[PDB]
Write a protein that binds this ligand. Sequence first.
Ligand SMILES: CC[C@H](C)c1ccc(NS(C)(=O)=O)cc1
Length: 282
Amino acid sequence: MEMEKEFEQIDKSGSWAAIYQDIRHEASDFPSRVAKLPKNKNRNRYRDVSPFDHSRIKLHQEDNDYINASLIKMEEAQRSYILTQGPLPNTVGHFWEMVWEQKSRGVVMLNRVMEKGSLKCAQYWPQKEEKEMIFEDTNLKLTLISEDIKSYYTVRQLELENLTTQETREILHFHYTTWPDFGVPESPASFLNFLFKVRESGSLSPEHGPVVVHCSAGIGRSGTFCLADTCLLLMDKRKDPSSVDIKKVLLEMRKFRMGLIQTADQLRFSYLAVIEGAKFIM
Ligand SMILES: CC[C@H](C)c1ccc(NS(C)(=O)=O)cc1
């Protein structure tokens, strides 16, 4: 079926939970043996969210190459994304090592450091220009260059230096600051505006490594971001845009990381975002 009328048909029939459970039943199951090794317990935020072995990002390190991060490679759309958990106190250095080694330009953050009164990720970037951060375990230096605070999101320019080679690179930090503590946003308008700002920066383009996107577990809000982006790109590429099937795209993405889209409300919000976004593109 088309999207916008399939949408109204699920609303009127109140069957979002059944649709979402079907997706959970059909989703791929691949091994995640490296994630479960005892030496990696303090590298995982949640025991039930792990990268598959076949798509995990490997650190270029002979001691321990593990990070909780997955490469989502979308062949028809010609887009790739790295989805990862919010960094932990003992993985901030690994996080920036990955950004460096994978040649990423942008980092997309969809959570606040504290939500619901608890810490959802480490404070992993510097908050003042004159107070830079040094990650001694991976030999990197990170400096805040500039910060632009808007009503729904903040953009930061960062400098990452590999202290071993003295090479430097500019990284863009795109921080969506207004996702509500419970539920999903009432309108997709600010989320779509944010997606377009990431696009306009070059951070999603083939001349760079894959964008790094995270929330707390790296599957819920993060899944919504890449699912909406990929669906809108396919609607531009194809002769028949109504042939884009959001449930099939989501199942394809779940071949690369488990659990993408965590609730039936997030599924409905993804439909809403793609529907409204397809009108603005034209
Ligand atoms: C950190 C704010 C600074 C003013 C800034 C730099 C870059 C961009 N975007 S871009 C994609 O490079 O055009 C936006 C803002």
